[PDB]
Each structure stands twice: as C-alpha cells, then as structure tokens.
Design a protein around this ligand. Sequence first.
Ligand SMILES: Cc1cc2nc3c(=O)[nH]c(=O)nc-3n(C[C@H](O)[C@H](O)[C@H](O)COP(=O)(O)O)c2cc1C
Ligand SMILES: Cc1cc2nc3c(=O)[nH]c(=O)nc-3n(C[C@H](O)[C@H](O)[C@H](O)COP(=O)(O)O)c2cc1C
Lengths: 246, 246
Amino acid sequence: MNEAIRTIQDHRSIRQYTDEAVSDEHLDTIIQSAQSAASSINGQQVTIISVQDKEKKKKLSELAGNQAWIDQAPLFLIFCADFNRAKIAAELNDAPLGVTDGLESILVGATDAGISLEAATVAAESLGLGTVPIGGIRRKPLEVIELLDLPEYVFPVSGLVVGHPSDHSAKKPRLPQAAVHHRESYNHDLKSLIQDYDAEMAEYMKKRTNGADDRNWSQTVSAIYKTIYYPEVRAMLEKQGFKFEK
Amino acid sequence: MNEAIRTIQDHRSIRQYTDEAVSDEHLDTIIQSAQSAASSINGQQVTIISVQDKEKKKKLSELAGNQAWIDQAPLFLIFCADFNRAKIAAELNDAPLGVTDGLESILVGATDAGISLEAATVAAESLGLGTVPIGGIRRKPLEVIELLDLPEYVFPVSGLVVGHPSDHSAKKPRLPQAAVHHRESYNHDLKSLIQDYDAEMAEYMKKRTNGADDRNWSQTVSAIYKTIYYPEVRAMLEKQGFKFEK
Ligand SMILES: Cc1cc2nc3c(=O)[nH]c(=O)nc-3n(C[C@H](O)[C@H](O)[C@H](O)COP(=O)(O)O)c2cc1C
Ligand SMILES: Cc1cc2nc3c(=O)[nH]c(=O)nc-3n(C[C@H](O)[C@H](O)[C@H](O)COP(=O)(O)O)c2cc1C
C-alpha cells in the first residue's frame, strides 16, 4: 500500500500532546493541502481560522465542552462554511445571492468543510503530527461567532486540533465492510452485522480499560443520539442570514 | 514533501475516462481508506453505494444533469448520510432516535460524508485513477432514493466518479492563501483579493480555451448562486424522516 493509503489506513486520533509548537512551514502545508482539495463549483466555501493564542484557545476549549486536548495543543484550526466570498462575488457582478435562502447552501458548506478537514488531516498526520476534529464547536456556536468575529453567511462547522503527539494511541475498529459498502442498491440486512461489531467493540473497550468498561458501539451511540444534543444549530444558521425552503 | 501531500497538492478532477474497469482490489482499497477516516462520535454516518451496472449508472447520470463522465467511467460511488444504523442501534438498546428531529443530524451526516469522499479521493488518485465528485445527485433526489432503495434516515450527499483517465487535464488555481486562511480572527478585507483572483482566473480560462472564454471566478459563482438551484433538498430530508427544531 502507498504512503498516501498508509496515512489514511493507519489513522488514530490523539488527545495527548506535547509543549512543542507547530511551525509555520507545517501550518502553510496543512492550509495549502486543504485548499488543493475539490470544492462544489470551485466556489471554495471553506474558511480556516488558526488559533494559537492560549487565552482565545482556552475560551474555545470551554465552549466545545471543556476538552483538555484543545488547550493542550499549540494550534486549533476552525473550518467554517463561507458564503461571504460568494456575497462579495455577487456584489462585484451586480447579482443577488439566492443560494443562502435554501438548504442546499447548508449541505454545500458542510460537505466542503468535511473535504477540507480530511485533506488537512492526511497532510498533518503524514508530517508526523496528531489530529482530532472538534464537532463540539456547535455546542455554543453563537459565542463562537462572537469570538472569531464571523460575518453574515459564515458558520462554524468543525474544529481540528493540530499538535505534536506524546502518545501513539490505538486504532478504533470500524464497521464491517458489508455494512458500509452496499453494491448497486441499499442493503437493509444490517442488524446481524451491527450485533457482530458490538461483540468486537465490547472486547476492544475491555482491553482498552483493562476490563473496566464493557461499552459496545450501539450502546455509546444510542446514548448521545437519544436526544437533540445541540439545540442552537438552527439559531446559528438563522443568525448568519441562512433561510430554508419549506 | 511526502506521497500523501504530493497526491493532494497535484489534485485535478478528471471528466475523460477509458473503457478500463476498476478492479475489486482497487475498490476494496478505496472503501477501506474511506472507512479508516474519522467520524463524529465513531457513529460512522456514511453509507457507500457502488454502481457498476451501465443501465443504473446511466439513469444516475441523466438525473445528475446529463453528466457524460458518469456513464463513461466504469464505477460511480455514492456517499449517503446514514442514520438508519443509528436507528437500528437505538432499537437494539430500547432507546428513541432524537438527533434526526434536529439540524445537527444534517450537519453531522454532510460533514462526515465529505470526509469519507475525501479519504476515497486521496486513495483512488494515489492508485493512478481519476475522480470527480457529483453534487448533482441533489438535482432530482426523490428519484435517487427510489433507484438506490434508500430507506428512512438515509439521504444522498455526493457521488464520486472513479475510473482510468484518458487525459491528465490541468490544476484549477485556488483562492489566495490570505483569503481562505485567517489568523486568530476573521479577515473582512477580501474584496481586493477576489478582484486579483478574478484577473488570474480570467488568464487561466484564456490559456485553457485558447483565448475563447474570459470567464472569471466571481462571474461563474454569481450566476449559479443567483438562485436556489436545488429546490427538492428540504423535500428530500423531510421525506427521509428528518425534522428541524424551528
Ligand atoms: C466531524 C467530527 C467531529 C468530532 N468531534 C469530536 C469532539 O468534539 N471531541 C473529540 O474528542 N473527538 C471528536 N471527534 C473524533 C471522533 O471521536 C473520532 O474520530 C472517532 O472516535 C473515530 O476514532 P479514530 O479517529 O481515533 O480512529 C470528531 C470527529 C469528526 C469527524
Ligand atoms: C461536493 C462537490 C460536488 C461537486 N459537484 C460537481 C458536479 O455536479 N459536476 C461536476 O462536473 N463537478 C462537480 N464537482 C467538482 C468541482 O467542479 C471541482 O472539484 C472544482 O472545479 C475544483 O477543481 P479541481 O477538483 O479539478 O481542482 C463537485 C465537487 C465537490 C467537492
């Protein structure tokens, strides 16, 4: 398998970091690789905010749910869906901005930010660094907008903790190929596959905690998806000037 | 510096393919790399449908807006935001599925699908193959759901055209670093950067068409984003059991 494939295949997210600062040469490579990725209609609907200042990064850590790894790492990247450039583009050509009144602008912005994050991940991890995305930036997103001074048509999607690792960690097992990859049409027989994966996941958790926790995949997923954990999501989009087509 | 960064740095979407079929060994590597990528709460909210049958793949091409490259390439991947596994997980633990009644489930599903599309992009491109994501899967989404037999809590995000290229094409220039990468806080002075970017994009389009087309970046973006081009987006999510918190 190629160095590119071995960077993706050997993926492990880390929460343990060193005092070692991320150099500007490393950051520029992470931003250039993220920009190099594909974007819907070459509109490049992703804005990246680099937070290195401890005080600001501490506020971001608390607003994401007091995650120790955010304040631990020297650099915290923030992937925002950006339609402000599309607004400047429309103003330059005396045209209105219609897309932001539909749910498509939300789907375009979120999908593009996921593409940019993964490119930033594969670039950073190939350099020897450790990454962990922070989807928790949508916990208190109105406070995130105020902090990062986000204008109209810009919304925070996910964060990304970039730093030098202190621990190698362990690869979390993934769902069986047959459960994720469906040939030609959708495969509805997935219950047995989820049951077999839960058995493998309970054994993984057991070996990870030294027989302290028996948490399977279905257990830990259903506990958080039991409710609407992030209520301020619609309030965040409606504040930035995004509307929907009922 | 390394093979992973090199694969991303020289990226280009391929729209001209050969009759050469994508092997099972290549497909399995692309799928395994996509699964190897990070997912919000390890929920793995991405489902991948492999379309290799010419007749089905032709229907998907015509629904995406007569995109020739879809019927030309031997494989047409389709990344779907999946909460049906989360529904099976909740049923196995006698728990309700609350997340789907909020906009967070839409943001999680779209961001995670973008990640999995990017992990497949770097894997396929490093193997020598050519790719082109299809955002056109959202043109007639209700027909896509019928075709792929997409159940409740499952929605099409973006397709991916994988095949053996017949031409190298060219790298599309990206926005100036200062316009996409903002240090500490958001930079509101982007108009001048877009204007300079339009001059460099008009020159790019002149050299690629041999002085036939003068299309700049802002003009291309203004025209499409002038309106809500995909109206069946909210009509797709709601049909698939997704609600919004008002
Ligand atoms: C969009 C997104 C959001 C995430 N948010 C968080 C988060 O708030 N906190 C955290 O510690 N990990 C977060 N993660 C990391 C996941 O928990 C992790 O990727 C998953 O458990 C898979 O494990 P692995 O990446 O270590 O192989 C997130 C991942 C993604 C892709
Ligand atoms: C989510 C997404 C959707 C896209 N949808 C389409 C599409 O419907 N048709 C198409 O030909 N290209 C589509 N593309 C490809 C873009 O036009 C292309 O990535 C962009 O012009 C940047 O150029 P490059 O990837 O060749 O460097 C899409 C890309 C992404 C990331």
